[PDB]
Amino acid sequence: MKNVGDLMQRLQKMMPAHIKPAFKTGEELLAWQKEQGAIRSAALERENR
Amino acid sequence: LKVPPHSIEAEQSVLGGLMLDNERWDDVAERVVADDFYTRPHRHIFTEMARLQESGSPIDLITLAESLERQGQLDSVGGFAYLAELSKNTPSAANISAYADIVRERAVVREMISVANEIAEAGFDPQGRTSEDLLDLAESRVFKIAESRANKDEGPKNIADVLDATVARIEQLFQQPHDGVTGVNTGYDDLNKKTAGLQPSDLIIVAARPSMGKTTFAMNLVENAAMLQDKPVLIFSLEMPSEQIMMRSLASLSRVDQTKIRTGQLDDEDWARISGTMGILLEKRNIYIDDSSGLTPTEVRSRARRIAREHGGIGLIMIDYLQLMRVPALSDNRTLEIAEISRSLKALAKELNVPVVALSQLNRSLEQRADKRPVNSDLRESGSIEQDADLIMFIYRDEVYHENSDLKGIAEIIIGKQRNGPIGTVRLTFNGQWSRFDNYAGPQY
Amino acid sequence: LKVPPHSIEAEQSVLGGLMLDNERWDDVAERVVADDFYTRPHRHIFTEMARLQESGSPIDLITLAESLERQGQLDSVGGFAYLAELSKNTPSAANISAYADIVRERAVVREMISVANEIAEAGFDPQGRTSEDLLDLAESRVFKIAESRANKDEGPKNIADVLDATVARIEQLFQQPHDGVTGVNTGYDDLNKKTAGLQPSDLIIVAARPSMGKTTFAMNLVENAAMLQDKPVLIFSLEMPSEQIMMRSLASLSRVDQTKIRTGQLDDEDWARISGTMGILLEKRNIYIDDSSGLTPTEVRSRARRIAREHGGIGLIMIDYLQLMRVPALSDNRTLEIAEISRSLKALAKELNVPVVALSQLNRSLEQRADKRPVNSDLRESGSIEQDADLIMFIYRDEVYHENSDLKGIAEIIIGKQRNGPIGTVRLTFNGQWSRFDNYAGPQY
Amino acid sequence: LKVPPHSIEAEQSVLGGLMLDNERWDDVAERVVADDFYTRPHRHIFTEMARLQESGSPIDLITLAESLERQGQLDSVGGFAYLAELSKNTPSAANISAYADIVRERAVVREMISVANEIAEAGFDPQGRTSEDLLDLAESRVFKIAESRANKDEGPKNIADVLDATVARIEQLFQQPHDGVTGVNTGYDDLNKKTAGLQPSDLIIVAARPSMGKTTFAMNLVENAAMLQDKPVLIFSLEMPSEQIMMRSLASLSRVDQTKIRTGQLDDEDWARISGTMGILLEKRNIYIDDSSGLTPTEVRSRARRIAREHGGIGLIMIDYLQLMRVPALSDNRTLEIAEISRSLKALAKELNVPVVALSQLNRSLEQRADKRPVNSDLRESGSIEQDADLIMFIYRDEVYHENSDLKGIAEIIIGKQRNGPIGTVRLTFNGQWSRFDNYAGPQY
Amino acid sequence: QLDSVGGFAYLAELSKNTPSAANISAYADIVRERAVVREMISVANEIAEAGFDPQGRTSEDLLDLAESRVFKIAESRANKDEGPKNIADVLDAT
Ligand SMILES: [Mg+2]
Ligand SMILES: [Mg+2]
Ligand SMILES: [Mg+2]
């Protein structure tokens, strides 16, 4: 029914240009996620304490 | 119907695997033995290849025959014409270890029935004999069976084994990249240790109370597995439809909240991270979702196998709130209905050689108890699915219950059982505003 | 000229196709089922073939014969010579699934003949009841087999398709510029945040101990809806009749005591505010109260589908003290009765695409606890209602237990589960003299 | 044994009843239809009589025959002599609308047979039809038949009808300007404020430990509403017989201690008040007492319907310590037993529109609290009595526990539940020697 | 349910019959009176044949059965002065 092209085009119809994802891949995703995980845990334990 | 049970197809397949692979002899030898087989020529070939893999490295087609000729046994085990069929058959992939283990199991069973007949004879045949020396015979026999067992991990350990690790510490422990994993990477390094990943031919059970986050976890697993594997994964969501599952998953990945997604209060700094993970989830086409209501295990089997054939072989099955699964045969008796469904899912796990994620609930027997850290019995039906599964693991987020807590944001994954390893208790962190468990950076447990 | 039709040439053609096409087992399984045949020997053959194709793959003519033999059943289903006559015939290759389609279609026709014959016979001699239940029996069989068949668009789909629907939702929500209320508004602004409004396919629950404000709060929800929502609403007052509900609602809407309505001791300002709320409620014609006591989910679905087709589509349902709902089939077991109730109400909400406010009492477990705030466990029966719901929100009003409290006139709405939103503890003000909850712009919580 | 269902004696019976009755026609017209009949001559008669009842009011024997002649149809519908058979017989009484309703639903039954025949006709004759144009077709058939549903006295109840009834009640109340007691009076002028009297249809519950004064309180309510209302009151003393109740009541009304009564040791001023209270009680003839032990609710119903028939209509019921009441079907599960009981009592109050007092007990959960002032959760069983009730009002006179208490002769009536009104703490004064509660002129509570 | 309980004309015949007067109390009296006797002889038969067939029983465990059934009849029947009494009928005994 629809492919990457048409779907992402309809997606840009929602949200404008220069929205580049800064992941592009499967490993940097999990890496930055773990980074933010530890950074969040820092202020989390801070808020607990 | 009634016969000596012995695997022969996978037997010849293992033998041809040893033919076409000189490498895979060690671990397969740790389980299968010459006495582990049923017929004679298979035993001959195994003992020959064992003697040769001790010394004679190249054995696929010819050196077996050469040794067989050195000892002069041609046409005693069939013949070279009988042998050619063995290298001919079994072009199978790396799935040989499971074959080896099940053939070991079949050998143990064969020993068991042999001993059973021996004991029947001993009972019918006293030969002027007190039953003291007869029950003692039987009990000594049973213990001699279960003693050796080729198994040394479920139980205590001699100090030799203890001091192995103790001294291995002080010299060899540079091993901190312990990524020792066999199966589906869960996506949780603190958890992947104690479980060794999802062994691809077992039954998983993820269960806890409803406000606790289990579905979030069992979505995080398939969510990672779609990305790491290049293999499909299935989602039987018998509770709620796809449009909420996916809206959750996008938020788990991108690290934004479902609210802004279903509302529209989200700027560039979220738009980008949604677009990226969306693009990733399109460029693989792994995941398939089924928003059914009242599936039967027959339909589970059918709808796993419609896809197992098309796309190589599927990698993971995920059932949501199992108990909704019906079978109109046992529409009256609930207990045997649940036990039927459990056995059926375990059968499917055996069939496709894939892991089955299949959730369940906890009855309200812990809430008349201050512990509230569940156990194997608090399992809501039949006491049956604590037997048909090689794995169970429960959850506990204390800050649903205690508002004062200093254990908040945190959620231990108790592992309540394993039949291929040790149990434990992981300690993750929960941030449900974007519906995710993360690996925890903190003190001991 | 007249017969239950069955194409038997195409039937046996599909049989022999499954015989000499051993790969293709699922494609025909998409449409053929064991009982789907017209003739029983074919049922025997197909169930043997299916049992083997699960476990034993290679079967065309002869190992299926051995499987039939292992239980000693040769010639009980015709004979193996006839089975070879099956295997010999039908060299068709192109089309099996279409033959299976027409065979299953004829089987559906056949079962329709069966059902119609059952109706005619159970109109001639159905053996004793009031025919009010007979009309319901017709409708029940009708809609049951409707739900048993109709879903054949069902199947696992692709993320490139699921995301289309997901992004459609995100489009029509991101399209429409409105505040964070994607659903039905409650009127309470501090409860719409934790809820985003009563979402349109859920089973909301509103529980609390007997005199705490269940019916009161729920009527305030439907009032605020009816005044805001421009679509009907239903009120299943199983407990107490309309002529109390509506006094209570007039007071809720116009802030005057119940006594000054059930006594006539009221002043000009009050006479006026009554005239106003009345002349409002008459112009819209939203509300529809059922003052019948012992309803079933069948009847609830019937009445709701009736108000639906005529008056557009409903927007909200309220069900007072769920536990009065019945289903006489399961009157011997109460837990299963409540389970059927809950599943029926969820399915209803999913059918008409509305919410279903479903009150429920609580058990006397929280009394011997010293906190008295209810937990998700303390629900009156079956514990399925703590599983089948997208939202629970208990009620707690401390002035009932504590006369030493500095927290009176204050009723707090302890959320206890929400699958797609946060837990919380909302806070509101109770003035039961006119049966209203109002917002509490006071200190934090 | 098996035949197309249709009844014909009711047919001719209704027709002749209309022949001998021009007054009552609309009531049968609301149920029966022209097509509702089986035979066409009677269809002609019914539709012609109905056309005339629109146009020509007097239709008994000759106006209808003359009309049927004006359409030129004599001897096509039998004959005028045959019609004389119709007009001669069936002089039956007012049980005519019963015939109307049953024949209405018999038309519905015959419709069911016809429609099942239609479905079986589409079945035998597929007409090359798709399953999706088959099921939903034949199912929307029954749905379309359900759409008829002339039983328009149920769930689809628009708001205006509710408000019509409510305004009618408010006119019942305001057209009679009186004090703020819209209900039964008690005599206790401090209690009617928090209660507005005992409402006619609610189920009242009076509850206290075994020697706290609840039989006494209830007897005072009944024997005061016997003196005020000129309307009967029943007493189901399941616990003690009449010969103690009435002694107690003589002492209550006449204020003489019971010991002077039975021992015969009383003085002239006492004998006078005895004479007076008896001369009242017999010059009103208003009280009935049933000293039966194990009454099921059906027995209670029947024995109250009798007095609601013979002696006008009743105004109060009192049931002592309902935990005696049985329903032998549920003898094993006590909880469900009591729930049935309470539901039956509520239904009785709604059937007769008269208040049911239902004394209950309390569990021993007060004693391990040190407060002892009871709450709803301290009811003896089932928790339905705290759900199917509308006014619980406990009794706690404190000198029973605290010997050294400054409240001797004080018994406070803790209204612990009330739907249509407030909770509170009434105070009274206990004078037990003559078995009375009296009002209390005292400080601010 | 038709024709398992006789017939339709069978049903009508009962209505056509018995235009008798208000002596319904006495008729229902005797019609009630006879069935308890029928149950009594039924129980007598049961007790006797159960005596013929002890099924691991002693006389002590058998006269107990007899007492139990006979008085379970008697108590279940004997309370036939029941009803809500007018107050005069109460105060007379008082
Ligand atoms: Mg879930
Ligand atoms: Mg209520
Ligand atoms: Mg008493």
Residues in B touching A33 (Cβ below 8 Å): 253, 255, 438
Number of other CB atoms surrounding residue B302 within 10 Å: 15
CA angle (B36 as vertex; B30, B40 as ends), nearest 5: 130
Work out the minimum CA distance from D271 to partner chain C, whole angstroms: 42
The amino acid at residue D306 is R
Q: How many CA atoms lie within 13 A of C193 on its CB side?
A: 6
A interface with C, Cβ–Cβ below 8 Å: 1-4, 7, 10-11, 14
Judge A/E contact: 3 or more CB pairs < 8 A: no
d(CA B116, CA B112): 6
CA angle (E82 as vertex; E81, E88 as ends), nearest 5: 85
Contacts of B6 (CB under 8 A, 6+ apart): B38, B106, B110
d(CA B204, CA B442): 27
Is B412:B372 a contact under the CB 8 Å cutoff? no
CA angle (D364 as vertex; D358, D367 as ends), nearest 5: 125
Number of other CB atoms surrounding residue C366 within 10 Å: 19
How far lies E33's CA from each of D239, E75, E77, in Å?
29, 15, 10
Number of other CB atoms surrounding residue C27 within 10 Å: 16
Residues in C touching D159 (Cβ below 8 Å): 246, 281-282, 285-289
Nearest alpha carbon to residue D355 among D218, D241, D230: D218
Helix boundaries (H) for C285-333: 297-310
Ligand 1 centre and the CA of B239: distance in Å? 6
d(CA D316, CA D235): 9
Is B13:B21 a contact under the CB 8 Å cutoff? no
Mapped onto helix, strand or coil, the DSSP state of residue D41 is: helix
Enclosing H/E stretch for B274: helix B268-282
Bridge-partner residues for D20, per DSSP?
Answer: none
Q: Tell me the two tokens of residue B258.
A: 């479902």
The packing angle between helices D97-124 and D135-146, to 10°, is 170
Tokens 């539901």 belong to: D343
Is B344:B299 a contact under the CB 8 Å cutoff? no
User: From edge to edge, which strands make up the β-sheet containing B436-438?
Assistant: B206-207, B391-396, B410-418, B424-431, B436-438
Is D141:D49 a contact under the CB 8 Å cutoff? no
Is C392:C418 a contact under the CB 8 Å cutoff? yes
Ligand 1 centre and the CA of C344: distance in Å? 18
Residues in C touching D386 (Cβ below 8 Å): 210
Nearest alpha carbon to residue C234 among C167, C292, C311, C286: C286
* C110, C142, C290 member nearest D139 (Cβ): C142
Number of other CB atoms surrounding residue C20 within 10 Å: 14
d(CA D386, CA D376): 6
Residues in C touching B432 (Cβ below 8 Å): 422
Is D304:D352 a contact under the CB 8 Å cutoff? yes
**For C188-222, b where at least 16 C-beta lie within 10 A, e where not — what string?**
bebbbbbbbbbbbbbbbbbbbbbbbbbbbbbbbbb
The packing angle between helices D242-254 and D214-228, to 10°, is 70
* φ, ψ (nearest 5 deg) of residue D438: -125, 165
Four-point Cα dihedral B346, B351, B356, B361, nearest 10: -20
Ligand 3 centre and the CA of D291: distance in Å? 13
Judge B/E contact: 3 or more CB pairs < 8 A: no
Judge A/C contact: 3 or more CB pairs < 8 A: yes
Which residues make up the environment of ion ligand 3, defined by Cβ < 5 Å?
D 215
d(CA C201, CA C353): 5
What is the distance of C-alpha C275 from the center of its chain? 39
d(CA C323, CA B141): 60
DSSP-derived secondary structure for B53-115? HHS----SSSHHHHHHHHTT-TTSSS-HHHHHHHHHS----STTHHHHHHHHHHHHHHHHHHH
Length of chain D: 445
User: From edge to edge, which strands make up the β-sheet containing D436-438?
Assistant: D411-413, D426-431, D436-438
Q: Tell me the two tokens of residue C331.
A: 């009157």
The amino acid at residue B264 is G
Is C54:B351 a contact under the CB 8 Å cutoff? yes
Work out the minimum CA distance from B282 to partner chain A, whole angstroms: 7
d(CA E25, CA C386): 57
The amino acid at residue E66 is A
Q: How many CA atoms lie within 13 A of C176 on its CB side?
A: 13
CB-CB under 8 Å, C171 with A10:
yes
Enclosing H/E stretch for D317: strand D317-319
- How do beta strands E85-86 and D426-431 pair? unpaired
Q: Tell me the two tokens of residue B183.
A: 């199966």
Work out the minimum CA distance from C33 to partner chain A, whole angstroms: 30
DSSP-derived secondary structure for D179-228? -S--SB--S-TTHHHHHSSB-SSSEEEEE--TTSSHHHHHHHHHHHHHHH
User: From edge to edge, which strands make up the β-sheet containing C317-319?
Assistant: C287-290, C233-236, C317-319, C357-360, C204-207, C391-394, C415-418
DSSP-derived secondary structure for B148-212? HTT--SSS---HHHHHHHHHHHHHH----------SB--S-HHHHHHHTSB-TTSEE-EE--GGG
Q: Tell me the two tokens of residue C261.
A: 């309505």
**For C92-114, b where at least 16 C-beta lie within 10 A, e where not — what string?**
eeeebeebbbbbbbbbbbbbbbe
d(CA E34, CA D343): 36
Nearest alpha carbon to residue D217 among D392, D363, D344: D392
- How do beta strands C157-158 and B287-290 pair? antiparallel
* φ, ψ (nearest 5 deg) of residue B202: -130, -175
Number of other CB atoms surrounding residue D132 within 10 Å: 12
d(CA D214, CA D319): 11
- How do beta strands B317-320 and B436-438 pair? unpaired
Q: How many CB pairs under 8 A join C and D?
A: 186
Mutation test of the interface with chain D: which of C227, C246, C319, choosing the one with the most D Cβ atoms within 10 A? C246
The amino acid at residue B268 is D
Structural domains for chain C: 1-158 (1.10.860.10), 159-445 (3.40.50.300)
What is the distance of C-alpha E76 from the center of its chain? 9
Tokens 């399992």 belong to: B379
Tokens 């087992």 belong to: C25
d(CA B248, CA B364): 28
Ligand 3 centre and the CA of D422: distance in Å? 27
Instruction: Enumerate the known binding-site residues of C for ATP.
Output: 211, 214-215, 419
- How do beta strands C233-236 and C287-290 pair? parallel
Is C401:C185 a contact under the CB 8 Å cutoff? no
d(CA C162, CA D236): 67
Residue B358 DSSP code:
E
Residues in A touching B431 (Cβ below 8 Å): 40
Q: Tell me the two tokens of residue B177.
A: 């990249």
d(CA A2, CA B121): 72
* φ, ψ (nearest 5 deg) of residue D25: -125, -35
Bridge-partner residues for C340, per DSSP?
Answer: none
CB-CB under 8 Å, D159 with C112:
no
d(CA D180, CA C225): 34
Q: Tell me the two tokens of residue C339.
A: 């389970």
Is D438:D429 a contact under the CB 8 Å cutoff? yes
- Asked if residue B419 belongs to a known ligand binding site, the reply is yes
DSSP-derived secondary structure for B26-49? HHHHTT--GGG-SSHHHHHHHHHH
Q: Tell me the two tokens of residue D357.
A: 């007092």
Enclosing H/E stretch for C397: strand C396-397
Is D179:D332 a contact under the CB 8 Å cutoff? no
Q: How many CB pairs under 8 A join D and E?
A: 50
Contacts of C161 (CB under 8 A, 6+ apart): A1, A2
Residue C324 DSSP code:
G
Q: How many CA atoms lie within 13 A of A23 on its CB side?
A: 26
The amino acid at residue B350 is K
What is the distance of C-alpha B183 from the center of its chain? 8
Residues in A touching C167 (Cβ below 8 Å): 7, 10-11
Residues in A touching B434 (Cβ below 8 Å): none
Contacts of D294 (CB under 8 A, 6+ apart): D238, D324, D325, D326
d(CA B401, CA E85): 59
Nearest alpha carbon to residue D142 among C134, C310, C327: C134
Bridge-partner residues for B431, per DSSP?
Answer: B436
Phi-psi region of B280 (alpha: psi -120 to 50; beta: other; left: phi over 0): alpha
Helix, strand, coil shares, percent, chain B, to 5: 45, 10, 40
Mapped onto helix, strand or coil, the DSSP state of residue D357 is: strand
Residue C30 DSSP code:
T
Residues in D touching E91 (Cβ below 8 Å): 246, 278, 281-282
* D246, D286, D288 member nearest E84 (Cβ): D288
Q: How many CA atoms lie within 13 A of C187 on its CB side?
A: 20
- Ligand with minimal distance to B210 CA: 1
Q: How many CA atoms lie within 13 A of A45 on its CB side?
A: 10
How far lies B160's CA from each of B64, B154, C436, in Å?
38, 16, 75
Nearest alpha carbon to residue D221 among D310, D315, D308: D315
* A3, A11, A14 member nearest C160 (Cβ): A3
d(CA B153, CA B166): 17
* CA atoms B126, B128, B133, B135: torsion sign: positive
The experimental technique behind this entry is: cryo-EM
D interface with E, Cβ–Cβ below 8 Å: 1, 9, 234-235, 242-243, 246-247, 250, 278, 281-282, 285-293, 303, 306-307
Nearest alpha carbon to residue C421 among B218, B322, B262, A41: B262
E interface with D, Cβ–Cβ below 8 Å: 3, 12, 79, 82-88, 90-91, 93-94
Enclosing H/E stretch for B368: none
* A1, A4, A11 member nearest C161 (Cβ): A1
* φ, ψ (nearest 5 deg) of residue B413: -100, 90
Tokens 């049951």 belong to: C144
- Asked if residue B259 belongs to a known ligand binding site, the reply is no
Mapped onto helix, strand or coil, the DSSP state of residue D380 is: coil
Instruction: Enumerate the known binding-site residues of C.
Output: 211, 214-215, 419
Q: Tell me the two tokens of residue B431.
A: 């941030």
* CA atoms B372, B373, B377, B382: torsion sign: positive
Tokens 């705290």 belong to: D386
d(CA B189, CA B177): 11
d(CA B366, CA B372): 5
Nearest alpha carbon to residue C348 among C178, C204, C155, C160: C204
Contacts of B320 (CB under 8 A, 6+ apart): B215, B218, B235, B236, B237, B238, B239, B240, B359
CB-CB under 8 Å, B400 with C377:
no
Nearest alpha carbon to residue B367 among E54, C375, C346: C375
Ligand 1 centre and the CA of B288: distance in Å? 18
How far lies C176's CA from each of C169, C170, C380, in Å?
11, 10, 40
Mapped onto helix, strand or coil, the DSSP state of residue C391 is: strand
Q: Tell me the two tokens of residue B310.
A: 């098309």
CB-CB under 8 Å, B242 with C165:
yes
Q: How many CA atoms lie within 13 A of D21 on its CB side?
A: 20
* φ, ψ (nearest 5 deg) of residue C295: -65, 165
Secondary structure E strands in B353-439 = 356-358, 391-396, 410-418, 424-431, 436-438
How far lies B204's CA from each of B180, B375, B386, in Å?
20, 16, 11
How far lies B331's CA from each of B294, B325, B385, C195, C384, in Å?
12, 11, 19, 36, 17
